[PDB]
Amino acid sequence: MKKGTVKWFNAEKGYGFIQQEEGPDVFVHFTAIEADGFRTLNEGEHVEFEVEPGRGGKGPQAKKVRRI
Numbered sequence: 001m002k003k004g005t006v007k008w009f010n011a012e013k014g015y016g017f018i019q020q021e022e023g024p025d026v027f028v029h030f031t032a033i034e035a036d037g038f039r040t041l042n043e044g045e046h047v048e049f050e051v052e053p054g055r056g057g058k059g060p061q062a063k064k065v066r067r068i
Contacts, residue, residue: 003048009041018049026051028062035067
């Protein structure tokens with residue numbers, strides 16, 4: 001499980017990328033956010049994402065994202 005602030009999350013297409021203390025590179029989609037309402041994050045806000053293996057096109061994906 002990883003936690004960090006988001007840098008940008010395109011809701012139009014349904015994709016985004018979260019950044020941690022260092023800002024590696026995680027693949028997150030609108031269908032990967034688990035919140036109470038509209039599945040999406042906020043630019044400059046904190047959110048916990050669960051990097052998964054066979055989930056992200058590149059590898060580690062936010063299989064489980066949470067609003068913070």
